[model samples]
Target chain A: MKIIRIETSRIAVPLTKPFKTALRTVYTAESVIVRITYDSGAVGWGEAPPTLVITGDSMDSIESAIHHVLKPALLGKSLAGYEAILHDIQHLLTGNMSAKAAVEMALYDGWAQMCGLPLYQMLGGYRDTLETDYTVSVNSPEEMAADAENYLKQGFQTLKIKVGKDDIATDIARIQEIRKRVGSAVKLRLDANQGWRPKEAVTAIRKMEDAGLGIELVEQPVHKDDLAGLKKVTDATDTPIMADESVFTPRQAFEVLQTRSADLINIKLMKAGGISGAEKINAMAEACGVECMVGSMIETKLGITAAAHFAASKRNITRFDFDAPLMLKTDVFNGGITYSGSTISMPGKPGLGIIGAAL
Target chain B: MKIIRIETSRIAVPLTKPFKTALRTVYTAESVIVRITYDSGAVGWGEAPPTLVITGDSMDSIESAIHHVLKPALLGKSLAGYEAILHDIQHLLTGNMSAKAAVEMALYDGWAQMCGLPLYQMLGGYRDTLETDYTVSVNSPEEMAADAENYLKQGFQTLKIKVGKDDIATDIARIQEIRKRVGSAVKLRLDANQGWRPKEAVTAIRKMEDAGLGIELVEQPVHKDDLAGLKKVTDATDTPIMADESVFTPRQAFEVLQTRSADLINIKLMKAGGISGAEKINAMAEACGVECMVGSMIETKLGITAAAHFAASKRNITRFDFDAPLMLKTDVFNGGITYSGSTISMPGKPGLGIIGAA
Candidate 1:
């Protein structure tokens, strides 16, 4: 089908609780929603949340890029030539990855429809279901423990406890309290959000290992640019270290994978610019025998659906952090992926299975 | 489209002229033909020629790999999930790159039909046309010069003269004679087929450079495994050096591109296992700002058609060495790509546009 029209709109949904991380605090999940119209009268939907600290994309820039750059180039193009289309989308402009990701999601959504398959099956069809891990935003130990326990009671098998906002001692206390409160049966991984130094991460992870706290993985413990430090922490600690902020492109992932700097990689569509980029990273990681976790910036269900489809499609993507939609105060998307607490499953319908645009 | 059946057959067609490189000489172009039958009754065709000295796949091995390994795994699989399908084809077994390439070619041909676009357009549709270079096999300086002049008379714009099978001086003499016969307007390239040592390659290329033979590039002058030696020749020479046997997978291409070992990469589907692998190598090379040339092993038009479709689809693949089909004595394939001397163009029909099995 030929792309007939493309439009973008800004969306904002209040978070049920303030999502705090080492980098920033978020009380609202704001995003740029993209809607593409094809000549066949079929509509494809995509979303990109403004992640200024991580993706360097604001709501305005995301919308601006789609209108000024991507939309103009893609207006009259055939979706069947997606290899070229996606290549142009990535190279036509530099940076603005979030905007590129949003447009790419729409393009994939439409192309999947043309194939008469769900987005996941169209990608690889590895699996039809995924289980997500709930995030306990960085907070006081007591509050974090309480949030962890609540998420566990809500049937989330895994808790992604956010740490590294404060001192190492406090971060250790946060994990200890959560483990003591929620018990050791649940899987607990930590996202430092590039918060700790190499030595600090080593000390903290060693302490957790000694305490038998059962921390599954530590993410972005040091800094994004510090691959050496990332490797140092990975070598020094028994805990698996993941590179989240360190990788944005396949070339970067290649360096990280080749160096064995990170035991695991966390891929986000916004960070990767879309499924095509994400798929390449996952493929490279698989070739190197490293596993990847598909995470997301703060986004609504629309973006989560796209990320989930991609994450579920590939065998290498074994971990999912698609809980951003659940944190929102209200569900605006009509249909896409359905959730049962921590469990996420795709609809059998073609494309994203969305009934209508939230707009 | 679901793949309903997969079959492989061996065919050998006599070459109009004995193809000779440094490694071996071939009087017959032999290959394993793969035909994949989809549930829609659409038939997709593919071919893999054995280059025992290069790809190490014989006709028997190619057929065995398709029947025993790839066919069993791919039967009843939907063609829509090609990323997964192609991935399994590459990883199902090791080192049967030619076998894997044949299966992948068939898969892509069927997938392109499902899309209702020509295979080239479905790939990337970079350009509608490509100009190919004829090969002047290694021989005496007089015979090589005669072959070059004859190809020039046949409307071939470029002639890839094979050298490096003998002494460096004889190699130099071969190029000098070809240049004298073909004139300065024709583009002349040399394929050593990994015959010369690194220093010998440097000396020969430098001598030709000084003589102003106007060589476009020198391909795989040293051994395939000698990246360090390849780099030595590349660093020492003025003419561009290409890595043919040096790269097979994307990982290898990444190392070559990163080390700047060679000025260019030559991608063949048989070496890559198919278009998916070829596409990955090209993407990585493009990311590293390196251009690629798509060449092929000895085969009929079927294999060359798939390679031509892939080569014509991408922007980074700027060079083509697809004269293998022209070397065969008889035309076995009914359709696919059309060749007017040096120019190869894709058929407007969907998929490979092959009317029937060869």
Candidate 2:
């Protein structure tokens, strides 16, 4: 089927609280949302957050680039020419790969819909359902303990807690508190978001490992720029180190894998740019015998669903964090997995199977 | 002089034409313009294009980070406490050195205003006015030739033309075209912007040299991630290779120097964050005997002027590319350098000295 039109919208979703990092804090979610409408009236929806604070894209610039520059280049292009579209967008624009990704997802979605198949099936479907983990941003021990307990009550078996807000001792204490409150059965993860230095990360992770903190993974404990430092931390820790901020592109993934920087790759759609980009990352990781975790930004169901579909398609993606929709102040769309404890039931409908907003 | 409050403003400027690269093109002058307003009503401006398409930042996220997150952490902090402020912002915020830099410029401006001296004096003062270079983005040989000739006519003695758009022969042909068109008086610089492979760069530069192109420097001839490759290219070429995208932090600068990646460091306020960060990069470059060029994003007079003052203060920053203000479609501010041919005049007033459009 021939492609017809491509459209993009810029949406500003106010954050529930400022997501603080050691360098800066984010208070709002400004994203470029893309919808690709085909000749047969099938449309696929995709979203990319202009995380300039992280990946360096603004809502206006990304939207304009996708619409005025990328869309024109993509119009009349077949969905099968995904790689070509990616190349064209990169060549025509500059490097807003995240924005390019959203458009890529839309094209995939439209193609899958036209074929009356799920996106997962279109993307080499592996499992009928995918499992997802919930994330708890950095907070006090008491606050984290309570949040962990609440997530457990809500049926999330795996939880990734944010660390690095406090000193190593404080962070460890907070993790211990959450572990105690949630019980040992829950799969626990810690993400420092590159808050610690190499020495500090090694010391802290080792201490936690010796103490039987049972952290499934540690995400970006050291700086993203320091690959050697990260590898050093990874070598020192038994607790698996997952690269988040450290892994932006497939090229970075190859470098990280070649150096054994981390145990797993935390594949976020925002960082990877979209489904196809993340797929390339997963393929590279698989080729290197490395497993990956499909993660998401604090997006609504629109982006989360797209990620979940891709996550379900790949067998190598062992861990998932399509929990962004749960963090939203309100849910605008319906469909997709029903979080049953630690597991989620993947949607079976054509494309993402997402319907209109509940309103 | 005791420093007081620091504030930030997010401004967006449109671009004249789309800047094409290997991955994308920029059509609008979209950037997060930061004005660090101080207690003395004197403000220093810095511009960072959250060039996620290039560097990875956006206007909204950068703006919020600067105003809501960074500004609060910096507001009411003393100017003398520059190091303290820098540490606090870095430690608290985590990775936004870019946003921190805009705030730093504002603080420096306030401090300079309080001292009743130009920012150059506050920064260390200057020996003489700086000669700035003009950049021509990746284009056809004829386009680059015309652009080079135009910049030369405008009095810019040094011209940086974009290469790596085509093969080695084509790239060399473009350089040859520019060199022939501009004649020997003009200093011709080549910027590959990390577009070439190591061997291609070496071969191309050697060919250009053999052709007697008299190349002054080459910036980021290979990929930023390939330090070894970059070193190989630098080692093989007689023409000096300058590192731009490869030198992100002072630590990266040290690595590049240690690896013998490039002969010179191109320091942009956006990449280095601001003057303070750029100063750190300059120090590292100086320790390694590597010279520096004070460069900027496509910013307004406010940001470019601040960069000029910073460049002038430093001894190592002999080359300048603070020509972004010249590319603006409208004059949004007052108190910038009067570009009389190639040399840009230094501001005599305190801080960045550029008054915002009220």
Candidate 3:
């Protein structure tokens, strides 16, 4: 069917608390949501968070690009030829892959709706229902302990804690506090967000390993550009180091895979720039026998739902972090969440099947 | 000085044409430019281009984070106690390092302006000059050849060409075409942008080497995350493989270094967050004996000038790609380039001495 209209909105979801990193702190659940409506009356929704701390986007530019540039360029185009549409948009916009990615998801959703099939099935059928991990942003030991306990109580078996803002001793102590609160039954993951120095991460992860904290993975411990430093941390620690900011594209995955620097990969739709980029990452990960997790930007139900379908469809995805929608203060988009605590039941609806509520 | 106002603007600079990437193409320059004005009416500017293909930021979230979220949080904060202000902003924003970074630069600039020092001096000034590499985006052989000739004529000694979109043969052929046009004297760096498969990168780099293309270095020839794959490519190719997307942070750098994945490191201020992050990368690279380059996103003169100072100050940066402002259609910033052909002289002014033109 011929395309009709592409619309985008900037939604400011306030965070429960500000999350601090080495360089900055984030106080809000800031994200951009895009809605594309076809002439046939089928609407597809996509969300892109301008994670400047991570990716480098701000709300204003993303909104303007979608409405003034991306929407104008994409309106009235046919939705069936996904590759052509993506290429055209990419050609029109040299960068801003995140904006293109939001539109790409909507386009995929539109195409899937046209076929009356779930987006996952259209992309590739499910390998199995995906398992999601709950993220615990950096906080005081008492707060982290309480948060971890709450997550475990809610039925989450896996918890990803944000570390690296503090010293190695403090980070270790926080992990220890959480571990003591949760006991050995829960799996712990630490994301440094590139906060620690290479040596600090090495010592911290090693300490965690020795402490029997059993961190499933550590993400971006050192800086983002220091791949060599990452390999050192990986070599020093028994826990798998998963690259978050490090793996921006499939080729980046190849570099990591070839080096064996990271044992696992954290695949975010926003970082991958959409499903196609994610698929490429999955293919590479699968080819190299590496594990991956289909993560999300801090998005609403619409984007999270799309990620879940894509995650469920992939076999290489070993972990999940599709808890973004749940973190929202309000459910702006009403979508599927078989939220058995941290575990979300995969959405089985056709084309993300998310019907967002009016703001 | 006490901060008076933090005004952030999001500017969308459309590209002259659709820039072709390996998997996609880009048409416009959708970037967030923030101007932080202090109580004394001094203004400092920061630009963040959410390079999704490279870093994953889109326009909407970045803007909202900056305006509704980050801007409100840091609006009236004093320029003094920089770390405290940055920490406060970071704590408030959650995970938007790019937005925080743009504001951070502006804050630093404001402080620098207040001190009547350039950003380099405020941040600890470096050497007086830095050599920058001009980037040649992915294009046809004839296009690249012509572009190479143009850059050479403009006095650029090093040219970093984008490859890996086409097959190995085509990629090699394009390099060969450029090499023929530029001849033997200039340094040729190829950034596959993680566009190549591991084996393909090896094959392509080897072919270029065998063809006597005089290739200096290849950046992210394979993927950034594939450390083992990168090592394979490095082991196979005679030319050095410089990690760009692969080197996001110091931890990633250690991983690459430990695995011997790359010979050189390309550090970008935007990707690494800022000067502090770049310093960490430089330390790791220096410790490991791997050379580094201070690169920049397609930013204005303000960002490039800051990067140039960082590059010049550090002796380990063997290559530079601070030519981003040169690509801009209009001169939005002042005190950037003293473009004297191949070598652009760094501003001696303190902090990032360069300021945006009013």
Candidate 4:
């Protein structure tokens, strides 16, 4: 099958609660949706959320990149050379990682459908099921602890606590309160959103450890460019340091892995550009004996489903943060990874299993 | 598309000459042909030549393994669950590597056809073109030399000379004659086929090195199970040493690679069970920074085409020994890999690109 046309649309689903990270806050999961139509009447859907603060992609740029650049480059391409097409999507233009991710996701969906396989099996098929950790967005100690308790009651065994917006003492208080509220059984990982200095990150993690907060791992403790700082924090702290923003491309992941800067890495589709790029990062991590977690920005089921296919397909990806879909006020698509409490399972149908678009 | 019916046939093509190796002598290239017909009326073809000494699979056993085991396990199974199906094909039963290889090759062919991709592109799409080395079977020094010269005249730049059948001195004479006849510029590698002792292999390789024989590599000089001996010879020789019979599964390849017993690995589909197993071995080797070459048993274009797809797909598979199709007396399939001189290229159409049953 060959792709004949490509079109883009916009979705603005309100979040149940405002999503707050240290860098920004969001009230809506607005995404640019890409639809690829093949000659055989097969349809593939992709979505790119505007994670402007992290990925430098706005909703307008995502749409424009697809319309002006990707569409023209891929209009008459055959799905037979699907990897070649994905290579073009990654390298034909620079930046706009979210736009490239969306287009590449749609291409993979089409290619998997052409092979009559679910996206996961088409990738690696390591497992058919996965369990995800829900995120507790940054807030006051009381509000964040309440969010953590609510997620635990909703059958999530893991809670990713977002911090680094306030002072180090307040961050420690936030973790202590969440641990006190949710009890010792729940797994708690913290994402600082690249908001702390190297020394402050080490002090905060050590304080949490001394307080017996049981922080599972700290993600992106320092700025994205501070590999040396990240390594300092990683070595100075007992909690495993995860390089989230410090690693995007495989080249970046290689540096982190080679230097042992992070015990773990967080691979998001928006950051790595798409399934192909993310798969490379995971492979490199797997080869280096480092584990990875597949996290997502504010994206819909379409984008998260693509990311989940990649995450569940590989063995090195041991952690999952696919709670973005749960935060949405309403689902925009029909089929994908179905969530049952904390567990996620691939759809039995082919491709992303989105039988119809409900947007 | 899903597989509906799988059928098997037999092909017995006379060899251009009696193929001599350290292990066995073959006058004919007889293979079991597997044809998998999908629900959409599309066809996928596979083949497995019986290598009784290497793989312990005969023509009858290959057919039975498909008809009694693989076909029954795969019929009505959707190709969408292909990896799962491949998993079952591998684990459904054990010890039938060639039989499993034929059935797996057919499944991959059918899957690639359904996806409208050539097998190579579907696998990895590393490269589309490859150059192959012709095999000069074990023979007298002069006859081997004549065969080497003829292959060079036919545009083959590399020759895989089979030795270790006779005494060490005779093998040396054979290499010296070939070098004298084909000249020093032509590339040469040797497959000993587990015929020599480890120390003798080391002594012979050193002799060749000192005699200015320019041997590129020597394969499986010691017994397959002799890891220590293989390592000794590998350590004792200046030329690169490859393990052919010493590796069959990824576990074996791991032992060889982890121990650094061989400089290279020879991956044959019949030994590795299929493309999937061979792919894993190559991945392990690639990660370990060891290069591999995809060799073959005596097979037709049907089998060689599948092997070529896998070889051309991966970057670490740096060498190709796909000259089996050249040794056949007649072509068996209609469309697959096309060879011009020593160059082999994938067909443009989907799957293995078989246009007809011819």
TM-score of each: 0.52, 0.49, 0.49, 0.54
Order of models, best TM-score first: 4, 1, 2, 3
Kept native contacts, as fractions per model, are 0.00, 0.00, 0.00, 0.00
How far off is residue B330 in model 2, in Å? Answer: 1.5
Calculate the i-RMS of every candidate, to one decimal place.
14.0, 24.5, 20.4, 11.1
lDDT of 4 by residue, A237-275 (tens): 889999999988898999999999999999998888888
Please name the candidate that would achieve the greatest lDDT relative to the true structure. Answer: 1
lDDT of 2 by residue, B99-183 (tens): 7666666666777777888888787876448787887755788988898888788778898777886788888878888889989
For model 2, what TM-score does chain A reach?
Answer: 0.92
lDDT score, residue B126, model 3? 57
Model 1 ranges off by over 4 Å: A19-26, B1-358
Q: Tens digit of lDDT per residue, candidate 3, span A169-271? A: 8888888898889897689877888998888788878787788778778888878788999888888888888888889878888898899888788888888
Candidate 1, residues B1-358, lDDT tens digits: the string is: 7876676666789998775667777788889888888878788889998878898898878888887789779866887677788889999999999999998899889888888999999999999899999988778889988878888888997989778877878888888988988898899978999999998889889999999999999999999999999999999988999999999999999989889999999999999999999999999999988899999998899999999999999999999999988888889989999989899998998898888755
Considering DockQ, which of the candidate structures 3 and 4 is the better prediction for this target?
4
DockQ of candidate 2 relative to the true structure: 0.01
Alpha-carbon runs more than 4 Å astray in model 4 = A19-26, B4-358
Question: Who is ahead in lDDT, 1 or 4?
Answer: 1
Chain B structural similarity as TM-score, candidate 4: 0.96
Worst 10 residues of 4 chain B by lDDT: B2-11
